[PDB]
Amino acid sequence: SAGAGAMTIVNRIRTDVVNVAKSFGAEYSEAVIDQIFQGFGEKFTNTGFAIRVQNKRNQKVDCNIRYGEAKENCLAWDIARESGLLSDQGHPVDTLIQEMFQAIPAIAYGADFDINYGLVKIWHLPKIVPVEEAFKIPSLPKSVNAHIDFFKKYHLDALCALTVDYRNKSTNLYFDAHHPEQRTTQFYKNILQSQQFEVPSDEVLEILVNCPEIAVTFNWSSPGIERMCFYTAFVNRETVPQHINPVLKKFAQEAPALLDNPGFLVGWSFGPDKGTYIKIDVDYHGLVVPSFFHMHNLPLP
Ligand SMILES: CC(C)=CCSP(=O)(O)OP(=O)(O)O
């Protein structure tokens, strides 16, 4: 029963994470997994936890695990620091999450882990605030401020989260996609073509019009948007658009959850052409999807 029968919730989680990774051919490191769970296993059992797979072009599927909780302080940072998961790089990322929590009150935070790497991100979730609140933050890439006109033009006025990617050396600003123009396929064409990104099929455009959340990625090495992502939730296995892509089908049908019918969150990423790929998270305990609708002032579907 090393991995079966009666077991703690945390051990069930670990076993499920490894099974997913093996099934999708994701790489992982046993030492990294152990290191993550020593620090964070208890959080994973009691809060909004998700397992993600994503399929970047010309590489293996990546398997991530992640959680969030409604605490005002960035509890992940002290945990990751003591676990040895978060070393200073001599870089703006090093102080960025601390600056985010200083500059804007959080109502929640989270952390994200690639099981082949360690801690990849920490999230800051304020209440929805004007995007200009982010310009207070010292270490934000200069590109962010430079996109003020872009944000206004595409109704990216309502900031709903921030993140720091320690691995990629980037930061995402997340927006509440409230504006009725964001219910039209033309919006998505236009925002993508504004950055010279790949425009997806009409089929996919028709899915994007339900997107409540738009992420925009910025970095310190270039003046432009690195990639953007449109997030859409589905309240059960069957409603995921399994026909769009085999990873969506397989994950929807096979992803483990401790709850008997989980929902999913799908991110549709686009970049130059790479940055164009799909991310899918299983709502392992069933907390994440309701919370996603609630945070965007949407009734649950
Ligand atoms: C759970 C929600 C609504 C957003 C999470 S941010 P993310 O993991 O998709 O960020 P990246 O893929 O690292 O850009």
Backbone angles phi, psi at 130, to 5 degrees: -60, 140
For residue 184, the number of C-alpha atoms closer than 13 Å in the C-beta half-sphere is: 10
Apex CA 41: angle with CA 105 and CA 111, to 5°?
A: 35
- Assess if residue 270 is contained within a domain: yes
Q: Tokens representing 139?
A: 């270490």
DSSP labels, 11-45:
HHHHHHHHHHHHHHT----HHHHHHHHHHHHHHHH
Q: Report the separation in Å between the CA atom of 255 and the middle of ligand 1, taken as the mean of its atom positions.
A: 18
Q: What is the dihedral of CA 96, 102, 108, 110, to 10 degrees?
A: 20
Dist CA 148 CA 7 (whole Å): 51
Of 69, 172, 214, 292, the one to substitute when testing ligand 1's pocket (max ligand atoms within 8 A of C-beta) is: 172
Pocket of ligand 1 (CB under 6 A): 112, 121, 163, 165, 172, 213, 215, 217, 229, 231, 265, 267, 279, 292
The whole-angstrom separation of Cα 244 and Cα 222 is 32
For residue 112, report the distance from its CA to the centre of ligand 1, in Å.
9
Closest Cα partner for 200 from 156, 157, 232, 168?
Answer: 232
User: Which protein residue's CA is at the shortest distance from atom 8 of ligand 1?
Assistant: 112
Domain assignment present for 2: no
Q: Is residue 1 included in any domain, yes or no?
A: no
**Resolution limit, Å:** 2.0
Identity of the residue numbered 245: N
**Cα-Cα-Cα-Cα dihedral sign, residues 159, 188, 68, 278:** negative
Give the chain's domain count: 1
Q: How many angstroms does the Cα of residue 269 sit away from the middle of ligand 1?
A: 10
| Residues in CB range of 113: below 8 A, 6 or more apart | 36, 40, 64, 65, 66, 85, 119, 120
Total residues found in the chain within this entry: 301
> Could you tell me if residue 204 is inside a domain?
yes
CB 249 within 8 A of CB 242: yes
Ligand 1 center from residue 66 Cα (angstroms): 10
Name the residue with tokens 């899915």: 207
The reply to whether 205 falls in a domain is yes
Residue 4 falls inside a structural domain: no
Print the domain residue range for 18. Answer: 9-295
Classified as helix, coil or strand, 112 is: strand
DSSP the chain: -TTSSS--HHHHHHHHHHHHHHHHT----HHHHHHHHHHHHHHHHHSEEEEEEE--TTSPPEEEEEEEE--SS-HHHHHHHHHT-----SSTHHHHHHHHHHHS--SEEEEEEETTTEEEEEEEE-SSEEGGGGGG-TTS-HHHHHTHHHHHHTT--EEEEEEEETTTTEEEEEEE---GGGGSHHHHHHHHHHTTPPP--HHHHHHHTT--EEEEEEESS-SS--EEEEEEEESSTTTS-GGG-HHHHHHHHH---SSSS--EEEEEEE------EEEEEEESSS-HHHHHHHHTT----
Tell me if 279 is assigned to a ligand binding site: yes
Ramachandran angles phi, psi of 74, nearest 5°: -85, 80
The answer to the question of residue 301 being in a domain is: no
Query: After which residues does the chain show a gap where C to N exceeds 2.5 Å?
Result: 273
Partners of 69 in the β-ladder: 109
CA 208 to chain centre: 16
- 227 CA closest ligand 1 atom index: 14
Integer angstrom CA distances of residue 93 from 70, 138, 178: 23, 11, 29
How was this model experimentally determined? Answer: X-ray
CB atoms < 10 A from the CB of 81, how many? 14
88 assigned to some structural domain: yes
Is 43 annotated in a binding site? The answer is no
Whether the Cβ atoms of residue 257 and residue 237 lie closer than 8 Å to each other:
no
Q: How far is the CA of 114 from the centre of ligand 1 (A)?
A: 12
Token duo for residue 70: 């409604």
- Look at residues 43, 144, 42, 149 and name the one whose alpha carbon lies nearest to residue 92: 144
